[PDB]
């Protein structure tokens, strides 16, 4: 289909004793395929989907070396930022980085991104042109000048349009059986009486992949927003996702209400009615 590859990196400082906790994960679309956890035994980049396991010893060696180096970069960053923000060495702080690339239906480059946060706020981000930096404050401005001088955006732009995109296609091919398959939502409605004159209708979508989905209610063919509730999309735990939407209605008027389900795995939207 249309696709992405993303890496996520988090370090949390441990004042008091030792090195930060570091956790890295890699995704193709909504599927985790690798992980590294500084608390685990292996001290290696580890496989998390069947299709990555066939990569040879030099892949695992390379990805291990790169992720451990990343962990050391984060550790130095936590020290530098404590200085920039004139902060005590007694408190715990966080650094986060995400990067990756999207391709369209034709598996060609659509966009790239590379962004950094300190203590959960935007710090520095590569702009969409993959040439410029957005710096949120004057600390980030210092970092922007440093990365200009080290040709960082040049290197990022080359990875994101090149290696990122080339390896994403490779994974898409090797993991075809799951990665290029769409699992349409299994849908149903439940009914929960609240009194002798009102009831809750709940429209369910289960076991779907990818996570993107839209659930909407209508009354007499018009969009309804009053008296509705929509929960956040959530993992089933087996690689698929779940979501529901609910509306409170006058008992006996259930028919007037319809639930509408849009998903990439569905040729045309579904309509459910009680």
């Amino acid at each position: 289909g249309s696709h992405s590859m993303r890496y996520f990196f988090t370090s949390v400082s441990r004042p008091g004793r030792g090195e930060p906790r570091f956790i890295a994960v890699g995704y193709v679309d909504d599927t985790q395929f690798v992980r590294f956890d500084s608390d685990a035994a292996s001290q290696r980049m580890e496989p998390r989907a069947p299709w990555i396991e066939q990569e040879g010893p030099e892949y695992w060696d390379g990805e291990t070396r790169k992720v451990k180096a990343h962990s050391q970069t984060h550790r130095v960053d936590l020290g530098t930022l404590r200085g920039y923000y004139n902060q005590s060495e007694a408190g715990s702080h966080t650094v986060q980085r995400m990067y990756g690339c999207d391709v369209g239906s034709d598996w060609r480059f659509l966009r790239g991104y590379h962004q950094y946060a300190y203590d959960g706020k935007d710090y520095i981000a590569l702009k969409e042109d993959l040439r410029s930096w957005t710096a949120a404050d004057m600390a980030a401005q210092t970092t922007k000048h440093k990365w200009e001088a080290a040709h960082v955006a040049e290197q990022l732009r080359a990875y994101l349009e090149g290696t990122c995109v080339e390896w994403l296609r490779r994974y898409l091919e090797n993991g075809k059986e799951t990665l290029q398959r769409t699992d349409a939502p299994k849908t149903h409605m439940t009914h929960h009486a609240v009194s002798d004159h009102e009831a809750t209708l709940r429209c369910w979508a289960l076991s779907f992949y990818p996570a993107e989905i839209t659930l909407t209610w209508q009354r007499d063919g018009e969009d309804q927003t009053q008296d509705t509730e929509l929960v956040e999309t959530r993992p089933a735990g087996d690689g698929t996702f779940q979501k529901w939407a609910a509306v409170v209605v006058p008992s006996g008027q259930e028919q007037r209400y319809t639930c509408h389900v849009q998903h990439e795995g569905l040729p045309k939207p579904l309509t459910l009615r009680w």
């Binding site: 990343h70 970069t73 930022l81 990067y99 290197q155 990875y159 290696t163 390896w167």
Partner: peptide
Amino acid sequence: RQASLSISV
């Protein structure tokens, strides 16, 4: 595959 690049703030 990760980016072959290693930089600090």
